[PDB]
Every structure is written in structure tokens, then in C-alpha cells.
PDB file of all heavy atoms in Angstrom:
ATOM      1  N   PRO A 880       5.443  10.138  11.275  1.00 57.37           N
ATOM      2  CA  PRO A 880       5.738   8.727  11.243  1.00 57.37           C
ATOM      3  C   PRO A 880       4.837   7.950  12.187  1.00 57.37           C
ATOM      4  O   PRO A 880       4.033   8.440  12.932  1.00 57.37           O
ATOM      5  CB  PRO A 880       7.208   8.634  11.624  1.00 57.37           C
ATOM      6  CG  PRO A 880       7.723   9.986  11.625  1.00 57.37           C
ATOM      7  CD  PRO A 880       6.560  10.852  11.922  1.00 57.37           C
ATOM      8  N   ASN A 881       5.070   6.595  12.153  1.00 58.54           N
ATOM      9  CA  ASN A 881       4.254   5.579  12.822  1.00 58.54           C
ATOM     10  C   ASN A 881       2.807   5.681  12.341  1.00 58.54           C
ATOM     11  O   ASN A 881       1.846   5.479  13.091  1.00 58.54           O
ATOM     12  CB  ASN A 881       4.352   5.679  14.350  1.00 58.54           C
ATOM     13  CG  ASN A 881       4.186   4.326  15.018  1.00 58.54           C
ATOM     14  OD1 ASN A 881       3.619   3.400  14.415  1.00 58.54           O
ATOM     15  ND2 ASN A 881       4.671   4.223  16.233  1.00 58.54           N
ATOM     16  N   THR A 882       2.651   5.945  11.048  1.00 58.55           N
ATOM     17  CA  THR A 882       1.368   6.036  10.396  1.00 58.55           C
ATOM     18  C   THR A 882       1.272   4.845   9.411  1.00 58.55           C
ATOM     19  O   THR A 882       2.060   4.780   8.472  1.00 58.55           O
ATOM     20  CB  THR A 882       1.176   7.348   9.672  1.00 58.55           C
ATOM     21  OG1 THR A 882       1.056   8.405  10.632  1.00 58.55           O
ATOM     22  CG2 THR A 882      -0.057   7.293   8.811  1.00 58.55           C
ATOM     23  N   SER A 883       0.309   3.982   9.647  1.00 56.66           N
ATOM     24  CA  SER A 883       0.186   2.791   8.849  1.00 56.66           C
ATOM     25  C   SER A 883      -0.369   3.147   7.472  1.00 56.66           C
ATOM     26  O   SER A 883      -0.981   4.197   7.291  1.00 56.66           O
ATOM     27  CB  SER A 883      -0.694   1.777   9.540  1.00 56.66           C
ATOM     28  OG  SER A 883      -1.980   2.408   9.857  1.00 56.66           O
ATOM     29  N   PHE A 884      -0.174   2.242   6.494  1.00 54.72           N
ATOM     30  CA  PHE A 884      -0.580   2.520   5.151  1.00 54.72           C
ATOM     31  C   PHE A 884      -0.850   1.196   4.439  1.00 54.72           C
ATOM     32  O   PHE A 884      -0.341   0.142   4.822  1.00 54.72           O
ATOM     33  CB  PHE A 884       0.472   3.310   4.389  1.00 54.72           C
ATOM     34  CG  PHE A 884       1.580   2.477   3.809  1.00 54.72           C
ATOM     35  CD1 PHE A 884       1.609   2.223   2.459  1.00 54.72           C
ATOM     36  CD2 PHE A 884       2.566   1.972   4.615  1.00 54.72           C
ATOM     37  CE1 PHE A 884       2.580   1.412   1.912  1.00 54.72           C
ATOM     38  CE2 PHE A 884       3.552   1.202   4.072  1.00 54.72           C
ATOM     39  CZ  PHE A 884       3.570   0.957   2.735  1.00 54.72           C
ATOM     40  N   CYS A 885      -1.610   1.269   3.346  1.00 55.70           N
ATOM     41  CA  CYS A 885      -1.898   0.151   2.451  1.00 55.70           C
ATOM     42  C   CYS A 885      -1.352   0.463   1.093  1.00 55.70           C
ATOM     43  O   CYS A 885      -1.043   1.618   0.801  1.00 55.70           O
ATOM     44  CB  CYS A 885      -3.387  -0.155   2.347  1.00 55.70           C
ATOM     45  SG  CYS A 885      -4.078  -0.902   3.785  1.00 55.70           S
ATOM     46  N   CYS A 886      -1.252  -0.536   0.232  1.00 55.41           N
ATOM     47  CA  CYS A 886      -0.523  -0.316  -1.008  1.00 55.41           C
ATOM     48  C   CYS A 886      -1.031  -1.266  -2.079  1.00 55.41           C
ATOM     49  O   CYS A 886      -0.829  -2.465  -1.912  1.00 55.41           O
ATOM     50  CB  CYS A 886       0.966  -0.477  -0.726  1.00 55.41           C
ATOM     51  SG  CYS A 886       1.942   0.612  -1.664  1.00 55.41           S
ATOM     52  N   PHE A 887      -1.560  -0.733  -3.127  1.00 53.77           N
ATOM     53  CA  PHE A 887      -2.191  -1.520  -4.200  1.00 53.77           C
ATOM     54  C   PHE A 887      -1.349  -1.400  -5.444  1.00 53.77           C
ATOM     55  O   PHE A 887      -0.393  -0.643  -5.550  1.00 53.77           O
ATOM     56  CB  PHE A 887      -3.600  -1.029  -4.479  1.00 53.77           C
ATOM     57  CG  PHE A 887      -4.373  -0.735  -3.202  1.00 53.77           C
ATOM     58  CD1 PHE A 887      -4.457   0.531  -2.667  1.00 53.77           C
ATOM     59  CD2 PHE A 887      -5.026  -1.777  -2.568  1.00 53.77           C
ATOM     60  CE1 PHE A 887      -5.167   0.776  -1.527  1.00 53.77           C
ATOM     61  CE2 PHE A 887      -5.754  -1.516  -1.404  1.00 53.77           C
ATOM     62  CZ  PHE A 887      -5.801  -0.229  -0.910  1.00 53.77           C
ATOM     63  N   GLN A 888      -1.743  -2.176  -6.484  1.00 54.29           N
ATOM     64  CA  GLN A 888      -1.090  -2.134  -7.769  1.00 54.29           C
ATOM     65  C   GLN A 888      -1.909  -1.558  -8.893  1.00 54.29           C
ATOM     66  O   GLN A 888      -1.398  -0.846  -9.723  1.00 54.29           O
ATOM     67  CB  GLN A 888      -0.630  -3.520  -8.185  1.00 54.29           C
ATOM     68  CG  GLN A 888       0.760  -3.845  -7.723  1.00 54.29           C
ATOM     69  CD  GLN A 888       1.409  -4.994  -8.503  1.00 54.29           C
ATOM     70  OE1 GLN A 888       0.742  -5.649  -9.293  1.00 54.29           O
ATOM     71  NE2 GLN A 888       2.679  -5.249  -8.242  1.00 54.29           N
ATOM     72  N   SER A 889      -3.216  -1.848  -8.885  1.00 56.86           N
ATOM     73  CA  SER A 889      -4.092  -1.393  -9.967  1.00 56.86           C
ATOM     74  C   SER A 889      -5.530  -1.480  -9.477  1.00 56.86           C
ATOM     75  O   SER A 889      -5.979  -2.522  -9.030  1.00 56.86           O
ATOM     76  CB  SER A 889      -3.946  -2.246 -11.212  1.00 56.86           C
ATOM     77  OG  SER A 889      -4.388  -3.579 -10.992  1.00 56.86           O
ATOM     78  N   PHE A 890      -6.270  -0.384  -9.607  1.00 56.99           N
ATOM     79  CA  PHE A 890      -7.656  -0.275  -9.139  1.00 56.99           C
ATOM     80  C   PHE A 890      -8.658  -0.872 -10.087  1.00 56.99           C
ATOM     81  O   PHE A 890      -9.604  -0.246 -10.470  1.00 56.99           O
ATOM     82  CB  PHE A 890      -7.978   1.167  -8.871  1.00 56.99           C
ATOM     83  CG  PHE A 890      -7.355   1.774  -7.621  1.00 56.99           C
ATOM     84  CD1 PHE A 890      -7.285   3.134  -7.490  1.00 56.99           C
ATOM     85  CD2 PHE A 890      -6.883   0.949  -6.642  1.00 56.99           C
ATOM     86  CE1 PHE A 890      -6.745   3.681  -6.318  1.00 56.99           C
ATOM     87  CE2 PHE A 890      -6.300   1.482  -5.510  1.00 56.99           C
ATOM     88  CZ  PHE A 890      -6.253   2.864  -5.344  1.00 56.99           C
ATOM     89  N   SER A 891      -8.446  -2.147 -10.480  1.00 57.52           N
ATOM     90  CA  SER A 891      -9.256  -2.764 -11.475  1.00 57.52           C
ATOM     91  C   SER A 891     -10.143  -3.837 -10.883  1.00 57.52           C
ATOM     92  O   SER A 891      -9.718  -4.576  -9.985  1.00 57.52           O
ATOM     93  CB  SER A 891      -8.406  -3.374 -12.614  1.00 57.52           C
ATOM     94  OG  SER A 891      -7.680  -4.498 -12.114  1.00 57.52           O
ATOM     95  N   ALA A 892     -11.385  -3.933 -11.388  1.00 60.50           N
ATOM     96  CA  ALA A 892     -12.319  -4.968 -10.916  1.00 60.50           C
ATOM     97  C   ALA A 892     -12.055  -6.336 -11.563  1.00 60.50           C
ATOM     98  O   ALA A 892     -12.480  -7.349 -11.047  1.00 60.50           O
ATOM     99  CB  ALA A 892     -13.742  -4.550 -11.224  1.00 60.50           C
ATOM    100  N   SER A 893     -11.282  -6.371 -12.670  1.00 62.88           N
ATOM    101  CA  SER A 893     -10.983  -7.590 -13.373  1.00 62.88           C
ATOM    102  C   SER A 893      -9.743  -8.263 -12.893  1.00 62.88           C
ATOM    103  O   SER A 893      -9.188  -9.113 -13.596  1.00 62.88           O
ATOM    104  CB  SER A 893     -10.895  -7.319 -14.858  1.00 62.88           C
ATOM    105  OG  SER A 893     -12.125  -6.843 -15.408  1.00 62.88           O
ATOM    106  N   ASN A 894      -9.200  -7.884 -11.729  1.00 61.81           N
ATOM    107  CA  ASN A 894      -8.186  -8.617 -11.077  1.00 61.81           C
ATOM    108  C   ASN A 894      -8.743  -9.898 -10.562  1.00 61.81           C
ATOM    109  O   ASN A 894      -9.735  -9.883  -9.800  1.00 61.81           O
ATOM    110  CB  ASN A 894      -7.547  -7.823  -9.982  1.00 61.81           C
ATOM    111  CG  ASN A 894      -6.170  -8.258  -9.594  1.00 61.81           C
ATOM    112  OD1 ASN A 894      -5.618  -9.194 -10.171  1.00 61.81           O
ATOM    113  ND2 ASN A 894      -5.556  -7.559  -8.640  1.00 61.81           N
ATOM    114  N   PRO A 895      -8.224 -11.081 -10.940  1.00 60.20           N
ATOM    115  CA  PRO A 895      -8.846 -12.338 -10.481  1.00 60.20           C
ATOM    116  C   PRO A 895      -8.587 -12.621  -9.023  1.00 60.20           C
ATOM    117  O   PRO A 895      -9.334 -13.406  -8.435  1.00 60.20           O
ATOM    118  CB  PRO A 895      -8.169 -13.401 -11.368  1.00 60.20           C
ATOM    119  CG  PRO A 895      -7.665 -12.659 -12.521  1.00 60.20           C
ATOM    120  CD  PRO A 895      -7.271 -11.332 -12.016  1.00 60.20           C
ATOM    121  N   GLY A 896      -7.583 -12.023  -8.400  1.00 55.57           N
ATOM    122  CA  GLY A 896      -7.406 -12.253  -6.960  1.00 55.57           C
ATOM    123  C   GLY A 896      -6.563 -11.262  -6.186  1.00 55.57           C
ATOM    124  O   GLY A 896      -5.439 -10.927  -6.561  1.00 55.57           O
ATOM    125  N   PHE A 897      -7.161 -10.751  -5.138  1.00 57.24           N
ATOM    126  CA  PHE A 897      -6.544 -10.003  -4.031  1.00 57.24           C
ATOM    127  C   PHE A 897      -5.749  -8.785  -4.378  1.00 57.24           C
ATOM    128  O   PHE A 897      -4.516  -8.787  -4.468  1.00 57.24           O
ATOM    129  CB  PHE A 897      -5.651 -10.960  -3.207  1.00 57.24           C
ATOM    130  CG  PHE A 897      -5.537 -10.477  -1.810  1.00 57.24           C
ATOM    131  CD1 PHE A 897      -6.683 -10.422  -1.023  1.00 57.24           C
ATOM    132  CD2 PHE A 897      -4.347 -10.050  -1.297  1.00 57.24           C
ATOM    133  CE1 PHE A 897      -6.606  -9.933   0.250  1.00 57.24           C
ATOM    134  CE2 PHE A 897      -4.270  -9.593  -0.004  1.00 57.24           C
ATOM    135  CZ  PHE A 897      -5.387  -9.568   0.763  1.00 57.24           C
ATOM    136  N   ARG A 898      -6.489  -7.692  -4.622  1.00 62.82           N
ATOM    137  CA  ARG A 898      -5.943  -6.492  -5.234  1.00 62.82           C
ATOM    138  C   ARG A 898      -4.878  -5.809  -4.390  1.00 62.82           C
ATOM    139  O   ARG A 898      -3.930  -5.215  -4.936  1.00 62.82           O
ATOM    140  CB  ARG A 898      -7.112  -5.546  -5.509  1.00 62.82           C
ATOM    141  CG  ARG A 898      -6.858  -4.598  -6.612  1.00 62.82           C
ATOM    142  CD  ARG A 898      -8.168  -3.835  -6.948  1.00 62.82           C
ATOM    143  NE  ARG A 898      -9.203  -4.707  -7.485  1.00 62.82           N
ATOM    144  CZ  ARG A 898     -10.349  -4.940  -6.852  1.00 62.82           C
ATOM    145  NH1 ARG A 898     -10.579  -4.421  -5.669  1.00 62.82           N
ATOM    146  NH2 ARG A 898     -11.257  -5.726  -7.398  1.00 62.82           N
ATOM    147  N   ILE A 899      -4.961  -5.884  -3.085  1.00 60.08           N
ATOM    148  CA  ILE A 899      -4.009  -5.168  -2.218  1.00 60.08           C
ATOM    149  C   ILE A 899      -2.693  -5.956  -2.160  1.00 60.08           C
ATOM    150  O   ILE A 899      -2.664  -7.154  -1.988  1.00 60.08           O
ATOM    151  CB  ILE A 899      -4.587  -4.980  -0.787  1.00 60.08           C
ATOM    152  CG1 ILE A 899      -3.547  -4.404   0.192  1.00 60.08           C
ATOM    153  CG2 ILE A 899      -5.246  -6.190  -0.269  1.00 60.08           C
ATOM    154  CD1 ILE A 899      -4.112  -4.019   1.488  1.00 60.08           C
ATOM    155  N   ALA A 900      -1.607  -5.211  -2.343  1.00 60.18           N
ATOM    156  CA  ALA A 900      -0.286  -5.793  -2.533  1.00 60.18           C
ATOM    157  C   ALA A 900       0.607  -5.707  -1.313  1.00 60.18           C
ATOM    158  O   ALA A 900       1.166  -6.715  -0.850  1.00 60.18           O
ATOM    159  CB  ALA A 900       0.436  -5.084  -3.732  1.00 60.18           C
ATOM    160  N   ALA A 901       0.758  -4.566  -0.693  1.00 62.94           N
ATOM    161  CA  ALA A 901       1.697  -4.407   0.390  1.00 62.94           C
ATOM    162  C   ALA A 901       1.066  -3.555   1.500  1.00 62.94           C
ATOM    163  O   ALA A 901       0.135  -2.816   1.299  1.00 62.94           O
ATOM    164  CB  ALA A 901       2.980  -3.653  -0.064  1.00 62.94           C
ATOM    165  N   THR A 902       1.540  -3.784   2.724  1.00 65.61           N
ATOM    166  CA  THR A 902       1.086  -3.062   3.858  1.00 65.61           C
ATOM    167  C   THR A 902       2.277  -2.404   4.549  1.00 65.61           C
ATOM    168  O   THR A 902       3.417  -2.568   4.143  1.00 65.61           O
ATOM    169  CB  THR A 902       0.353  -3.947   4.824  1.00 65.61           C
ATOM    170  OG1 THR A 902       1.218  -4.976   5.278  1.00 65.61           O
ATOM    171  CG2 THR A 902      -0.870  -4.564   4.190  1.00 65.61           C
ATOM    172  N   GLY A 903       2.015  -1.631   5.614  1.00 65.04           N
ATOM    173  CA  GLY A 903       3.116  -1.356   6.485  1.00 65.04           C
ATOM    174  C   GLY A 903       2.884  -0.083   7.295  1.00 65.04           C
ATOM    175  O   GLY A 903       1.771   0.276   7.551  1.00 65.04           O
ATOM    176  N   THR A 904       3.995   0.559   7.666  1.00 66.42           N
ATOM    177  CA  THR A 904       3.950   1.754   8.486  1.00 66.42           C
ATOM    178  C   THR A 904       5.042   2.678   8.083  1.00 66.42           C
ATOM    179  O   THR A 904       6.112   2.258   7.623  1.00 66.42           O
ATOM    180  CB  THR A 904       4.028   1.372   9.984  1.00 66.42           C
ATOM    181  OG1 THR A 904       4.034   2.566  10.770  1.00 66.42           O
ATOM    182  CG2 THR A 904       5.268   0.562  10.278  1.00 66.42           C
ATOM    183  N   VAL A 905       4.816   3.975   8.243  1.00 65.01           N
ATOM    184  CA  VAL A 905       5.794   4.989   7.820  1.00 65.01           C
ATOM    185  C   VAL A 905       6.870   5.073   8.897  1.00 65.01           C
ATOM    186  O   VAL A 905       6.567   5.343  10.075  1.00 65.01           O
ATOM    187  CB  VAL A 905       5.142   6.347   7.563  1.00 65.01           C
ATOM    188  CG1 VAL A 905       6.165   7.420   7.516  1.00 65.01           C
ATOM    189  CG2 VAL A 905       4.426   6.327   6.250  1.00 65.01           C
ATOM    190  N   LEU A 906       8.122   4.844   8.479  1.00 64.78           N
ATOM    191  CA  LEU A 906       9.222   4.782   9.437  1.00 64.78           C
ATOM    192  C   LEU A 906       9.719   6.172   9.808  1.00 64.78           C
ATOM    193  O   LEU A 906       9.748   6.525  10.953  1.00 64.78           O
ATOM    194  CB  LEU A 906      10.326   3.933   8.834  1.00 64.78           C
ATOM    195  CG  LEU A 906      11.512   3.526   9.720  1.00 64.78           C
ATOM    196  CD1 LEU A 906      11.002   2.631  10.771  1.00 64.78           C
ATOM    197  CD2 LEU A 906      12.542   2.847   8.882  1.00 64.78           C
ATOM    198  N   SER A 907      10.124   6.970   8.801  1.00 59.54           N
ATOM    199  CA  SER A 907      10.586   8.322   8.979  1.00 59.54           C
ATOM    200  C   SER A 907      10.384   9.069   7.644  1.00 59.54           C
ATOM    201  O   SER A 907      10.034   8.484   6.652  1.00 59.54           O
ATOM    202  CB  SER A 907      11.994   8.374   9.458  1.00 59.54           C
ATOM    203  OG  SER A 907      12.465   9.741   9.538  1.00 59.54           O
ATOM    204  N   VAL A 908      10.657  10.377   7.684  1.00 59.09           N
ATOM    205  CA  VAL A 908      10.636  11.178   6.446  1.00 59.09           C
ATOM    206  C   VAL A 908      11.938  11.966   6.408  1.00 59.09           C
ATOM    207  O   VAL A 908      12.576  12.266   7.431  1.00 59.09           O
ATOM    208  CB  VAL A 908       9.433  12.129   6.394  1.00 59.09           C
ATOM    209  CG1 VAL A 908       8.183  11.332   6.144  1.00 59.09           C
ATOM    210  CG2 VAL A 908       9.303  12.891   7.667  1.00 59.09           C
ATOM    211  N   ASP A 909      12.323  12.300   5.174  1.00 59.72           N
ATOM    212  CA  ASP A 909      13.628  12.939   4.968  1.00 59.72           C
ATOM    213  C   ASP A 909      13.609  13.566   3.574  1.00 59.72           C
ATOM    214  O   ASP A 909      12.656  13.493   2.823  1.00 59.72           O
ATOM    215  CB  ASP A 909      14.745  11.907   5.022  1.00 59.72           C
ATOM    216  N   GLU A 910      14.720  14.310   3.286  1.00 61.13           N
ATOM    217  CA  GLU A 910      15.075  14.631   1.937  1.00 61.13           C
ATOM    218  C   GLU A 910      16.452  14.038   1.679  1.00 61.13           C
ATOM    219  O   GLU A 910      17.258  13.942   2.618  1.00 61.13           O
ATOM    220  CB  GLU A 910      15.087  16.136   1.684  1.00 61.13           C
ATOM    221  N   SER A 911      16.711  13.592   0.426  1.00 61.38           N
ATOM    222  CA  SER A 911      17.998  13.073  -0.007  1.00 61.38           C
ATOM    223  C   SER A 911      18.444  11.835   0.790  1.00 61.38           C
ATOM    224  O   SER A 911      19.343  11.893   1.632  1.00 61.38           O
ATOM    225  CB  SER A 911      19.111  14.138   0.061  1.00 61.38           C
ATOM    226  OG  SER A 911      19.584  14.295   1.380  1.00 61.38           O
TER     227      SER A 911
END
């Protein structure tokens, strides 16, 4: 954890504006 990340929706060049959608950081990991 405490590893930052980026987050997109579609890897397309024909997006008219701002391909990256969400940012953030990994809080924790778990199962269930």
C-alpha cells in the first residue's frame, strides 16, 4: 500500500478531451 496509481477509461486517440479519469493511492489489500 501507499502506492499511487492512475486510472483511464479507454486508450483511444479519438477522445476529444482528457483521457485520464481517476487518480489516487492504494489504501490496503485484502480478500473478501
Side-chain angles (χ1 to χ4, degrees), residues 880-908 911:
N881 211 338
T882 290
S883 55
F884 85 103
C885 286
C886 216
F887 317 96
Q888 269 199 352
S889 66
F890 285 163
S891 69
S893 297
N894 202 359
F897 208 61
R898 206 171 295 113
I899 173 171
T902 60
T904 178
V905 164
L906 191 66
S907 175
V908 288
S911 81

